Design a protein around this ligand. Structure first.
Ligand SMILES: [Ca+2]
Ligand SMILES: [Ca+2]
Ligand SMILES: [Mn+2]
Ligand SMILES: [Mn+2]
Lengths: 228, 246
């Protein structure tokens, strides 16, 4: 049984791409002006330095894992929030994608993407459902299951994602303690077909073009357990 | 930092009350006939042998904790399901209560009860909301927040309860993998006012009088983390799970 875990409360163990930056001991994924306001046309991704193994081609074994983290998103003009943030598993060398939250290129299934992510969509792209949602994306910006999400502008969101290899079920939940609100989404996912043996875990967030908000991760914890 | 944790996949580390029984390496809380069918007018509670400390009067510190477990509930005649099952924190010597799921006596707040529980109500007692729900009970069978729950008769339910001392927020979620269904309920809870420094954790389940189902716990995991300074530090679920649950 191979185990890999970590816990950060204060964010060089990360690989940053684009506007991704850490300051104030907190990961800030999208751009922010001197005044401290967001930025239009931004994109940033942050990934853990050491790659983790999802499954083993030989043994056939598949790891069950879990991850949690807290994040605050502030969008002046709540109604002009965009585009959102996502937790993802991408192929190692992976260079950013479309600005789609920087992880996908189209709303059409493309196994070649070898990318799976949990999105926290704040702007509804008329593939997207009518309101802010939590979605499970498998090789396409078109989620395979979504859930209504009451966004608490400025407030923190404590989220928890888990993947049970036995049931092949992936589950996610955002929770705003400020308002005692809670949400979940579940969905089977054949991880062996959607991704590589080894992937990179992390975050990716974008902002609008014409519509922006902040994307700051506050704490991050992770653990994976691969059998023989 | 004082830590207490455990994990059971195969159920004498438990204190049983009433019809509570373990057989087939699985905790069976309500009665079952030879034929294997439920039983009317049943009640059973099961608790971990060692008591756990929720907070410290002196230090002022309050522990953040989490618990998970899998359970199957079968009720022939789905529409005649009753009464449900609950996870609870009760004062140590605690003898069972009303048959209310065996943990409360009235729908009126009574601090003297010093009991807090997460209910999985299957029969709607016209205090209860119209359909099966998940509720947070604080010293009363009248939940302080509830959530609609789609019951998968016979199928397993993987549940997870957590209490963040920093936010004083308590959260719960049942999940039926058979049907990829999920549910949550959240609610602030001033644990220091609702319970004793030391409590007993466990389960309690009842059945109807006139209406029954089975209440079998399959696996149980738990972890608590008490600090020294009033300063609270939520747990590591990311870890507590894979390591304990997955
Ligand atoms: Ca969108
Ligand atoms: Ca009831
Ligand atoms: Mn979407
Ligand atoms: Mn109720």
């Amino acid at each position: 049984a191979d185990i890999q875990s970590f816990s950060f409360k204060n964010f060089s163990s990360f690989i940053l791409q684009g506007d991704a930056t850490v300051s104030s001991s907190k990961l800030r994924l999208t751009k922010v002006k001197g005044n401290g306001l967001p930025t239009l046309s931004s994109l940033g991704r942050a990934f853990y330095s050491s790659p983790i193994q999802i499954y083993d081609k030989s043994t056939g074994a598949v790891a069950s894992w879990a991850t949690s983290f807290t994040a605050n998103i502030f969008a002046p003009n709540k109604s002009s929030s965009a585009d959102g943030i996502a937790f993802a598993l991408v192929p190692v060398g992976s260079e950013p994608k479309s600005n789609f939250l920087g992880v996908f290129d189209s709303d059409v299934y493309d196994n070649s993407a070898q990318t799976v992510a949990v999105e926290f969509d704040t702007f509804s792209n008329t593939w997207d459902p009518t309101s802010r949602h939590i979605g499970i994306d498998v090789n396409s910006i078109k989620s395979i299951r979504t859930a209504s999400w009451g966004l608490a502008n400025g407030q923190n969101a404590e989220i928890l994602i888990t993947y049970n290899a036995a049931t092949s079920l992936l589950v996610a939940s955002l929770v705003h303690p400020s308002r005692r609100t809670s949400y979940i989404v579940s969905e089977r996912v054949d991880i062996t077909n959607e991704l590589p043996e080894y992937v990179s875990i992390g975050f990716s967030a974008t902002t609008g073009l014409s519509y922006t908000e902040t994307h700051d991760v506050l704490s991050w914890s992770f653990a994976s357990k691969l059998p023989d």
